[PDB]
Design a binder for this molecule. Structure first.
Ligand code: BGC
Ligand code: BGC
Ligand code: BGC
Ligand code: BGC
Ligand code: BGC
Ligand code: BGC
Lengths: 121, 121
């Protein structure tokens, strides 16, 4: 189970460890690039990079998947969008009214899977 | 509800969105640097960067804090240690037998606070 703990005082401006996302994609997601770190293979084409502002987070997301991640799109709490990138294989699954905290996953030559850590509202 | 969800298939090798950590420190934590992205001020001295290997995550952490983050130390499941860095002020608190998932927080000229998301085992 996901939990959290706060340490420290009340000062300063908020930040998140999740800074940016890009992907390489063709018919599948070949790779996801998190904070500049490449996870996956060398196929497909490189998307533009989406950089989160302060206070910004993924609030809704659609992931198409089967054996691999086929496609990703998301929208933030500030009305910004990323994607869709990828193909039309697999089946869709959507998250709505969330706050994504972290993106982990598994990868080889492709992005096999995403493990999304989030608050569900 | 804090939760997580897996999308996709069974293949590939796990990765984390939290790839590396460094700090600037003196008597306090001046800054935390997450996947190279700086949060905090330019005081103190810059630590080496700690980069997580495959299958490696933070398993134990000690944070000293008061009005700021005074000190951080952690150990991974592979037995590698980071820190301690910072000073001897504040009060200590420890996470034990965890998997750290994400590090968020707040910062100004110093690291004011951390919000650590983790699984407790
Ligand atoms: O995304 C999976 C594959 O889709 C194909 O259409 C592209 O030509 C490849 O480079 C890519 O690896
Ligand atoms: O996720 C990659 C592929 O997995 C297969 O199991 C599905 O049948 C395809 O629709 C999908 O494109
Ligand atoms: O990413 C697609 C695949 O790439 C291969 O190189 C890995 O060994 C598989 O486990 C994985 O399913
Ligand atoms: O970490 C708090 C402060 O500690 C002092 O010992 C250092 O000289 C400063 O550069 C630093 O900003
Ligand atoms: O965290 C910065 C400082 O906060 C104060 O509230 C504590 O009394 C000090 O011990 C600590 O060094
Ligand atoms: O980070 C320590 C301090 O730096 C200042 O610049 C900010 O205005 C304070 O909110 C913060 O507590």
């Amino acid at each position: 189970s996901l939990t959290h703990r706060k340490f420290g005082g009340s000062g300063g401006s908020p930040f998140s460890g999740l800074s940016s996302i890009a992907v390489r994609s063709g018919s599948y997601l070949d790779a996801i690039i998190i904070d500049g770190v490449h996870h996956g293979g060398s196929g497909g084409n490189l998307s533009p990079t989406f950089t989160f502002g302060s206070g910004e987070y993924i609030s809704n997301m659609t992931i198409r998947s089967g054996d691999y991640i086929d496609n990703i799109s998301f929208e933030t709490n500030m009305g910004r969008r990323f994607g869709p990138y990828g193909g039309s294989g697999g089946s869709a699954n959507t998250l709505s009214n969330v706050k994504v905290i972290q993106i982990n996953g598994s990868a080889g030559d492709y992005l096999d899977s995403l493990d999304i850590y989030y608050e569900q509202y």
